[PDB]
């Protein structure tokens, strides 16, 4: 089927320091619209969350 829901595990490191987030979202595959909520599984990100935006959906 076409998608209706999604979950994401996004992780890696910035400047040598690990990060890890999880969350879930939805979208309309007939309209190209999507939304997502994410939370760090550790502390706050040490870098701008905007740097992740192109890797979100």
């Amino acid at each position: 089927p076409l998608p209706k829901t999604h979950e994401l595990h996004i992780f890696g490191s910035f400047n040598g320091v690990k990060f890890d987030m999880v969350g879930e979202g939805t979208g309309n595959p007939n309209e190209g619209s999507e939304e997502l909520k994410l939370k760090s599984t550790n502390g706050p990100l040490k870098f701008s969350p905007y740097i992740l935006v192109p890797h979100l959906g």
């Binding site: 979950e7 595959p29 619209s33 905007y50 192109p54 890797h55």
Partner: protein
């Protein structure tokens, strides 16, 4: 963007949608070169449970100046963008754009983005026949803290425009 299974094409399914529907799939590889010498690399991988997608995205960035807008949280928004797709072969999309953020001091922060989408099975003839394909990309991000985020996106594929 990162879940292009939600993107339709102008006259039918996008290749991303077709590869989910037929259970063959694709993988995503990216390299992003920032103006201040930093770079980000990423690998996006998916599994599926029917209409539900599971993403595992590994994003690695290095060389960001400690006093620059990334490490000091000065990015304010991602500019609207137009992404260009061409298909160098029947299993590969090369995606490019110039990516810019606005910042708190009024300068833009620039990046050259490159992406390959690699498909297990060839894309359909009707996809391959229309190149380039362009995608208009709008995003929004809220976050009260650097701990939780709310993201929204709208994309529109187009190969033409008139006036």
């Amino acid at each position: 963007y990162a879940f292009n299974q939600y993107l339709p094409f102008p006259d039918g399914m996008s290749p991303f949608q077709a590869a989910m529907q037929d259970e063959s799939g694709y993988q995503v590889h990216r390299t992003l070169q920032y103006e201040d010498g930093a770079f980000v690399t990423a690998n996006l991988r998916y599994t599926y449970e029917g209409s539900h997608i599971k993403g595992e995205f590994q994003v690695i960035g290095t060389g960001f100046p400690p006093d620059g807008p990334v490490m000091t949280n000065k990015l304010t928004a991602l500019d609207w963008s137009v992404v260009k797709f061409v298909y160098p072969n029947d299993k590969t999309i090369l995606s490019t754009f110039d990516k810019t953020y606005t910042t708190t001091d009024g300068k833009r922060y620039q990046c050259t983005f490159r992406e390959n989408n690699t498909f297990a099975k060839p894309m359909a003839a009707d996809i391959l026949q229309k190149q380039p394909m362009f995608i208009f990309h709008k995003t929004e991000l809220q976050h009260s803290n650097n701990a939780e985020l709310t993201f929204k996106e709208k994309q529109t594929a187009f190969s033409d425009m008139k006036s």
